[PDB]
Amino acid sequence: MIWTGLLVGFLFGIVLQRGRICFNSAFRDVLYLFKLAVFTLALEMILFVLLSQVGLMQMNPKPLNLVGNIIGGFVFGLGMVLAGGAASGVTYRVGEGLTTAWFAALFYGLGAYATKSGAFSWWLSWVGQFKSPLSVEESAYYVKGAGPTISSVLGLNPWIPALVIAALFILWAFGTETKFNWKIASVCLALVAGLGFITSTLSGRKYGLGITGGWINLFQGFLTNSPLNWEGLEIVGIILGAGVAAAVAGEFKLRMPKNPVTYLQVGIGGLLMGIGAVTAGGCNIGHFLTGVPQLALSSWLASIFFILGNWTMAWILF
Ligand SMILES: CCCCCCCC/C=C\CCCCCCCC(=O)OC[C@H](O)CO
Ligand SMILES: CCCCCCCC/C=C\CCCCCCCC(=O)OC[C@H](O)CO
Ligand SMILES: CCCCCCCC/C=C\CCCCCCCC(=O)OC[C@H](O)CO
Ligand SMILES: CCCCCCCC/C=C\CCCCCCCC(=O)OC[C@H](O)CO
């Protein structure tokens, strides 16, 4: 059943490559992607509580760690701008044929590994002491010991804030040239997110779409001989689906940057991202795309600082 990760990641890479969902150029606002993000977030907000109510799922919000979330998200934004894309853009653009993406994803994997259990694990160990003891109790909506949410703190059934924020986000989007329209893209992305949440919970990992854990699992399987899980097969599926969707659309091509220093630029970027995500407890997918619709406070804070670090590094380079 861990091989359902391959299929979920295949569909994920297809929708990512076709919709061109770049998170690094989404956190930089248009002087399409913003509305795509808000609509996907609202649809996931409704769908997660729906699937948890019908017993197909349980939301598992990530724990709160102010130092962790804040600083890791800032560094993750820095690295995402230095790498020319966050953890999703990089990973799926590997399959499009961009060698820059190859470094970026590879140094991202190495840095995440080193931060979790390697030369940078002292920093993660020091950060872990600021973990918030706040946790929710087991419910039809939440897994026992999960992080605090907007609904849990307000003492409300998750349906209430889910529906209110989601309806406000739909008003949001609909109130203000590709034929893969942003609404159908959001619908397909939310459906893929729900499918991933379900199949991953049945796989043993009670969570939705992620990136960091998949790369860590792949590197661990290659260098440790450990068995791969749902997330590593999901990463391989992301790459495979992005590649297939780019080749069918005639968009696949092995490419190089204009100047070789970009290779040095992205290689550092990914590294920062690897240190960022693991410190922040999540990437642009694990926190923003997956944890925000669960109304996780840690995910919202981590996304805030994703965008802040993005802005800082964007001014530094530009
Ligand atoms: C410093 C960050 C470098 C990032 C490079 C990414 C690519 C990884 C490949 C080789 C790195 C080898 C260097 C590993 C540095 C830590 C090794 C270590 O444990 O250092 C102990 C110390 O030197 C007393 O024994
Ligand atoms: C140039 C940069 C210099 C450094 C500035 C970086 C900006 C972030 C700093 C602090 C945020 C976190 C503040 C720490 C708050 C207290 C520790 C904590 O989070 O504790 C929570 C837990 O419930 C009980 O420990
Ligand atoms: C209407 C749309 C939603 C609006 C609402 C957005 C919800 C807040 C989001 C992110 C902040 C999350 C962190 C908030 C700061 C927590 C700091 C704190 O007090 O933590 C203490 C300690 O860690 C434990 O007791
Ligand atoms: C180049 C321009 C750079 C401009 C500056 C970059 C952005 C700095 C903004 C915010 C830093 C963090 C402040 C956020 C508040 C942290 C304090 C906090 O969360 O405290 C919790 C408390 O400890 C619970 O017990």
Coordinates of C-alpha atoms and ligand atoms in Angstrom, one line a residue:
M1 CA 0.0 0.0 0.0
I2 CA 3.1 2.2 0.3
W3 CA 3.0 2.1 -3.5
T4 CA -0.1 4.3 -3.5
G5 CA 2.4 7.0 -2.8
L6 CA 3.7 6.5 -6.3
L7 CA 0.3 7.0 -7.8
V8 CA -0.5 10.0 -5.6
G9 CA 2.8 11.6 -6.4
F10 CA 2.3 10.8 -10.1
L11 CA -1.0 12.7 -10.2
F12 CA 0.6 15.4 -8.0
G13 CA 3.5 15.9 -10.4
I14 CA 1.1 16.0 -13.3
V15 CA -1.0 18.8 -11.8
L16 CA 2.1 20.7 -10.6
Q17 CA 3.7 20.6 -14.1
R18 CA 0.6 21.5 -16.0
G19 CA -0.6 24.2 -13.6
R20 CA 3.0 25.5 -13.2
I21 CA 2.3 25.8 -9.5
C22 CA 5.4 27.6 -8.4
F23 CA 5.4 28.5 -4.7
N24 CA 8.4 30.7 -4.8
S25 CA 6.8 32.9 -7.5
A26 CA 3.5 32.7 -5.6
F27 CA 4.9 34.1 -2.3
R28 CA 6.1 36.9 -4.6
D29 CA 2.9 38.5 -5.6
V30 CA 2.1 39.7 -9.1
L31 CA 3.9 43.0 -8.8
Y32 CA -3.2 33.6 -11.0
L33 CA -1.0 31.8 -8.5
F34 CA -2.3 33.7 -5.5
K35 CA -6.0 32.8 -6.4
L36 CA -5.0 29.2 -7.2
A37 CA -3.4 29.0 -3.7
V38 CA -6.4 30.5 -1.8
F39 CA -9.0 28.4 -3.7
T40 CA -7.0 25.2 -3.1
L41 CA -6.7 26.1 0.5
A42 CA -10.4 26.6 0.9
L43 CA -11.3 23.4 -0.9
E44 CA -8.8 21.5 1.2
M45 CA -10.3 23.1 4.3
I46 CA -13.7 21.7 3.4
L47 CA -12.5 18.4 2.1
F48 CA -10.3 17.4 5.0
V49 CA -13.0 17.9 7.6
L50 CA -15.4 16.1 5.2
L51 CA -13.2 13.1 4.8
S52 CA -12.4 13.0 8.6
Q53 CA -16.1 13.2 9.4
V54 CA -16.9 10.2 7.0
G55 CA -14.2 8.2 8.7
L56 CA -11.8 8.1 5.7
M57 CA -9.2 10.3 7.4
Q58 CA -8.0 12.1 10.5
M59 CA -6.3 15.5 10.4
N60 CA -2.8 15.5 12.0
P61 CA -1.7 19.1 12.5
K62 CA 2.0 19.6 13.1
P63 CA 3.1 20.6 16.6
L64 CA 3.8 24.2 17.5
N65 CA 7.4 25.3 17.9
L66 CA 7.8 29.1 17.8
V67 CA 11.6 29.1 17.5
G68 CA 11.4 26.2 15.1
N69 CA 8.5 27.4 12.9
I70 CA 9.7 31.0 12.8
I71 CA 13.4 30.6 12.1
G72 CA 13.2 27.5 10.0
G73 CA 10.5 29.1 7.8
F74 CA 12.7 32.3 7.4
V75 CA 15.7 30.2 6.4
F76 CA 13.4 28.1 4.1
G77 CA 12.3 31.2 2.3
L78 CA 15.9 32.4 1.9
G79 CA 16.9 29.0 0.5
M80 CA 13.8 28.8 -1.8
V81 CA 14.7 32.1 -3.5
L82 CA 18.4 31.1 -3.7
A83 CA 17.4 27.8 -5.3
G84 CA 14.9 29.2 -7.8
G85 CA 11.9 27.5 -6.3
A86 CA 10.7 25.9 -3.0
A87 CA 10.5 22.2 -2.3
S88 CA 7.8 21.5 -4.8
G89 CA 9.0 23.6 -7.8
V90 CA 12.5 22.1 -7.5
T91 CA 11.3 18.5 -7.1
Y92 CA 8.9 18.6 -10.0
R93 CA 11.2 20.7 -12.3
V94 CA 13.7 17.8 -11.9
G95 CA 11.5 15.8 -14.3
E96 CA 11.3 18.7 -16.8
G97 CA 15.0 18.4 -17.5
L98 CA 16.6 21.3 -15.6
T99 CA 20.0 20.3 -14.2
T100 CA 19.8 23.3 -11.8
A101 CA 16.8 21.5 -10.3
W102 CA 18.9 18.4 -10.1
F103 CA 21.5 20.1 -7.8
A104 CA 18.9 22.0 -5.9
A105 CA 16.8 18.9 -5.0
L106 CA 20.0 16.9 -4.3
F107 CA 21.6 19.4 -1.9
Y108 CA 18.1 19.9 -0.4
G109 CA 18.0 16.2 0.3
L110 CA 21.5 16.1 1.7
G111 CA 20.8 19.2 3.9
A112 CA 17.6 17.8 5.2
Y113 CA 19.3 14.5 6.1
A114 CA 22.2 16.4 7.8
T115 CA 19.8 18.5 9.8
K116 CA 17.7 15.5 10.9
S117 CA 20.4 13.1 11.9
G118 CA 23.7 14.4 10.6
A119 CA 26.2 17.2 11.1
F120 CA 23.4 19.8 11.6
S121 CA 21.4 17.7 14.0
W122 CA 22.8 19.7 17.0
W123 CA 20.8 22.7 15.7
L124 CA 17.6 20.7 15.4
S125 CA 18.3 19.3 18.9
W126 CA 18.7 22.8 20.3
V127 CA 15.6 24.0 18.6
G128 CA 13.5 21.1 19.8
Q129 CA 13.5 22.3 23.4
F130 CA 11.1 25.2 22.5
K131 CA 8.4 22.7 21.4
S132 CA 5.0 23.8 22.7
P133 CA 3.4 21.2 25.0
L134 CA 0.0 22.1 23.6
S135 CA -1.8 19.2 22.0
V136 CA -5.3 18.2 21.0
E137 CA -6.9 15.0 22.1
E138 CA -8.1 12.1 19.9
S139 CA -11.2 12.8 17.9
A140 CA -12.9 11.9 14.7
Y141 CA -11.2 15.0 13.3
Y142 CA -7.8 14.9 15.0
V143 CA -5.1 12.4 15.9
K144 CA -4.1 12.2 19.5
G145 CA -1.2 14.4 20.5
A146 CA -1.5 16.6 17.3
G147 CA -0.7 20.3 17.3
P148 CA -3.2 23.0 18.3
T149 CA -5.5 24.3 15.6
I150 CA -7.6 27.4 15.1
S151 CA -10.7 25.4 16.1
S152 CA -9.1 23.6 19.0
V153 CA -7.9 26.9 20.6
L154 CA -11.3 28.5 20.1
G155 CA -12.9 25.4 21.6
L156 CA -15.1 24.9 18.5
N157 CA -15.9 21.9 16.3
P158 CA -13.4 22.1 13.3
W159 CA -16.4 22.3 10.9
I160 CA -17.2 25.9 12.1
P161 CA -13.8 27.6 11.4
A162 CA -13.2 25.4 8.4
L163 CA -16.5 26.5 6.8
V164 CA -16.1 30.2 7.8
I165 CA -12.5 30.6 6.6
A166 CA -13.2 28.5 3.5
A167 CA -16.3 30.5 2.4
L168 CA -14.4 33.7 3.0
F169 CA -11.6 32.4 0.9
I170 CA -14.0 31.4 -1.9
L171 CA -15.4 35.0 -1.8
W172 CA -11.8 36.1 -1.7
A173 CA -10.8 34.3 -4.9
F174 CA -13.9 34.8 -7.0
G175 CA -14.4 38.4 -6.1
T176 CA -11.0 39.7 -7.4
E177 CA -3.9 32.6 -20.6
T178 CA -3.5 28.8 -20.1
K179 CA -6.5 26.6 -20.6
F180 CA -5.6 24.7 -17.4
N181 CA -7.8 27.1 -15.5
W182 CA -6.9 28.0 -11.9
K183 CA -10.3 26.7 -10.6
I184 CA -10.0 23.3 -12.1
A185 CA -6.4 23.2 -11.1
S186 CA -7.4 23.9 -7.5
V187 CA -10.1 21.3 -7.7
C188 CA -7.7 18.6 -9.0
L189 CA -5.0 19.7 -6.4
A190 CA -7.5 19.4 -3.5
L191 CA -8.7 16.0 -4.8
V192 CA -5.1 14.8 -5.1
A193 CA -4.4 16.1 -1.6
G194 CA -7.3 14.2 -0.2
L195 CA -6.3 11.0 -2.0
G196 CA -2.8 11.4 -0.6
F197 CA -4.0 12.0 2.9
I198 CA -6.3 8.9 2.7
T199 CA -3.7 6.5 1.1
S200 CA -0.9 7.8 3.3
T201 CA -2.9 7.3 6.5
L202 CA -3.6 3.8 5.3
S203 CA 0.1 3.5 4.6
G204 CA 1.0 4.3 8.2
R205 CA 1.9 8.0 7.8
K206 CA -1.1 9.9 9.1
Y207 CA -0.6 13.0 7.0
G208 CA -1.2 14.5 3.5
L209 CA 1.2 15.7 0.8
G210 CA 4.8 16.3 1.9
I211 CA 8.3 16.7 0.4
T212 CA 11.0 16.7 3.1
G213 CA 10.2 13.3 4.5
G214 CA 10.2 11.8 1.0
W215 CA 13.7 13.0 0.2
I216 CA 15.0 11.9 3.6
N217 CA 13.4 8.5 3.1
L218 CA 14.9 8.1 -0.4
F219 CA 18.4 9.0 0.8
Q220 CA 18.0 6.7 3.8
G221 CA 16.9 3.9 1.5
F222 CA 19.9 4.4 -0.8
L223 CA 22.6 4.9 1.8
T224 CA 21.2 2.8 4.7
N225 CA 19.3 0.0 2.9
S226 CA 16.2 1.0 4.9
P227 CA 12.8 0.2 3.2
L228 CA 11.1 3.1 1.4
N229 CA 7.8 4.5 2.7
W230 CA 4.8 6.3 1.2
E231 CA 6.6 9.6 1.0
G232 CA 9.7 8.5 -0.9
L233 CA 7.6 6.7 -3.5
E234 CA 5.5 9.9 -3.6
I235 CA 8.6 11.9 -4.4
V236 CA 9.6 9.5 -7.2
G237 CA 6.0 9.7 -8.4
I238 CA 6.2 13.5 -8.4
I239 CA 9.3 13.4 -10.6
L240 CA 7.8 10.7 -12.9
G241 CA 4.5 12.5 -13.4
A242 CA 6.1 15.9 -14.0
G243 CA 8.4 14.2 -16.5
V244 CA 5.5 12.5 -18.3
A245 CA 3.4 15.6 -18.4
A246 CA 6.3 17.7 -19.7
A247 CA 7.2 15.2 -22.4
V248 CA 3.6 14.8 -23.6
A249 CA 3.2 18.5 -23.8
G250 CA 6.5 18.8 -25.7
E251 CA 8.0 20.8 -22.8
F252 CA 10.8 18.4 -21.7
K253 CA 14.3 19.5 -22.5
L254 CA 17.7 19.1 -20.8
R255 CA 18.7 22.7 -20.0
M256 CA 21.5 24.6 -18.4
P257 CA 21.6 28.1 -16.8
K258 CA 23.1 31.1 -18.7
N259 CA 26.0 31.4 -16.2
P260 CA 27.6 28.6 -14.3
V261 CA 27.5 30.4 -11.0
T262 CA 23.8 29.6 -10.9
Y263 CA 24.8 26.0 -10.2
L264 CA 26.7 27.3 -7.1
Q265 CA 23.7 29.6 -6.3
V266 CA 21.0 26.9 -6.3
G267 CA 23.2 24.3 -4.5
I268 CA 23.5 26.5 -1.5
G269 CA 19.7 27.3 -1.8
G270 CA 18.6 23.7 -1.5
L271 CA 21.0 23.3 1.4
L272 CA 19.3 26.2 3.2
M273 CA 15.9 24.7 2.4
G274 CA 17.0 21.4 3.8
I275 CA 18.0 23.1 7.0
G276 CA 14.9 25.2 6.9
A277 CA 12.2 22.6 6.4
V278 CA 13.5 20.1 8.9
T279 CA 13.8 23.0 11.4
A280 CA 10.4 24.4 10.6
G281 CA 8.9 20.9 10.8
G282 CA 7.7 21.2 7.2
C283 CA 8.1 22.6 3.7
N284 CA 5.9 24.7 1.4
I285 CA 3.8 21.5 0.9
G286 CA 3.8 20.0 4.4
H287 CA 3.1 23.3 6.1
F288 CA 1.4 25.7 3.7
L289 CA -0.4 23.4 1.3
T290 CA -1.2 20.6 3.7
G291 CA -1.1 22.0 7.3
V292 CA -2.8 25.3 6.7
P293 CA -6.1 23.8 5.6
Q294 CA -6.0 21.8 8.8
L295 CA -5.9 25.2 10.5
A296 CA -2.6 24.3 12.2
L297 CA -1.2 27.3 14.0
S298 CA 2.4 26.1 13.4
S299 CA 1.7 25.8 9.6
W300 CA 0.3 29.3 9.4
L301 CA 3.2 30.8 11.3
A302 CA 5.7 28.8 9.2
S303 CA 4.1 30.1 6.0
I304 CA 4.2 33.7 7.3
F305 CA 8.0 33.3 7.8
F306 CA 8.4 31.4 4.5
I307 CA 7.1 34.6 2.8
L308 CA 9.2 36.9 5.0
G309 CA 12.4 35.0 4.2
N310 CA 11.4 34.9 0.5
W311 CA 11.1 38.7 0.6
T312 CA 14.4 39.2 2.4
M313 CA 16.4 37.0 0.0
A314 CA 14.6 38.5 -3.0
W315 CA 15.8 42.0 -2.0
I316 CA 19.3 40.7 -1.3
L317 CA 19.7 39.2 -4.8
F318 CA 17.5 41.7 -6.6
Ligands
LIG1 C1 29.8 22.4 6.2 C2 28.7 22.1 5.3 C3 29.1 21.4 4.0 C4 27.9 20.9 3.2 C5 28.3 19.9 2.1 C6 27.2 19.3 1.4 C7 27.6 18.1 0.6 C8 28.0 16.9 1.6 C9 29.3 16.2 1.1 C10 30.4 16.3 1.8 C11 30.4 17.2 3.1 C12 31.5 16.7 4.0 C13 31.7 17.6 5.2 C14 30.8 17.2 6.4 C15 31.0 18.2 7.5 C16 30.6 17.6 8.9 C17 31.5 16.3 9.1 C18 31.8 16.2 10.6 O1 31.2 15.4 11.3 O2 32.8 17.0 11.2 C19 33.5 16.6 12.4 C20 34.6 17.5 12.7 O3 35.4 17.9 11.5 C21 35.6 16.9 13.7 O4 35.5 15.5 13.6
LIG2 C1 19.4 38.3 13.5 C2 18.4 37.3 14.1 C3 18.6 37.2 15.7 C4 17.6 36.2 16.3 C5 16.2 36.7 16.0 C6 15.4 35.7 15.2 C7 13.9 36.0 15.1 C8 13.1 35.0 15.9 C9 13.4 35.1 17.4 C10 12.6 34.6 18.3 C11 11.3 33.9 18.0 C12 11.1 32.9 19.0 C13 11.3 33.5 20.4 C14 11.4 32.5 21.5 C15 10.2 32.5 22.4 C16 10.5 31.7 23.7 C17 10.8 30.3 23.5 C18 9.6 29.5 23.1 O1 9.2 29.5 21.9 O2 8.9 28.7 24.1 C19 7.6 28.2 23.8 C20 7.3 27.0 24.7 O3 5.9 26.9 24.9 C21 8.0 27.2 26.0 O4 9.4 27.1 25.8
LIG3 C1 -9.3 34.5 9.7 C2 -8.1 33.8 9.2 C3 -7.3 33.2 10.3 C4 -6.9 34.2 11.4 C5 -6.3 33.6 12.6 C6 -4.9 33.1 12.3 C7 -4.4 32.1 13.3 C8 -3.0 32.3 13.8 C9 -2.0 31.9 12.7 C10 -0.7 31.8 13.0 C11 -0.2 32.2 14.3 C12 0.2 31.0 15.1 C13 1.0 31.3 16.4 C14 0.3 32.3 17.3 C15 1.3 32.8 18.4 C16 1.3 31.8 19.5 C17 2.4 32.3 20.5 C18 2.1 31.7 21.9 O1 1.4 32.4 22.7 O2 2.6 30.4 22.3 C19 2.7 30.1 23.7 C20 3.3 28.8 23.9 O3 4.0 28.4 22.7 C21 2.2 27.8 24.2 O4 1.4 28.2 25.3
LIG4 C1 15.8 42.9 5.4 C2 14.6 43.3 6.2 C3 14.5 42.5 7.5 C4 13.3 42.9 8.3 C5 13.1 42.1 9.5 C6 12.8 40.6 9.1 C7 11.4 40.2 9.7 C8 11.4 40.3 11.2 C9 9.9 40.1 11.7 C10 9.6 39.4 12.7 C11 10.7 38.6 13.6 C12 10.0 37.8 14.6 C13 8.9 38.5 15.4 C14 7.7 37.7 15.6 C15 7.3 37.6 17.1 C16 8.1 36.6 17.9 C17 7.9 36.7 19.4 C18 7.1 35.5 19.9 O1 6.5 34.7 19.1 O2 7.0 35.2 21.3 C19 6.2 34.1 21.7 C20 6.3 34.0 23.3 O3 7.7 33.7 23.7 C21 5.4 32.8 23.8 O4 5.7 32.6 25.1

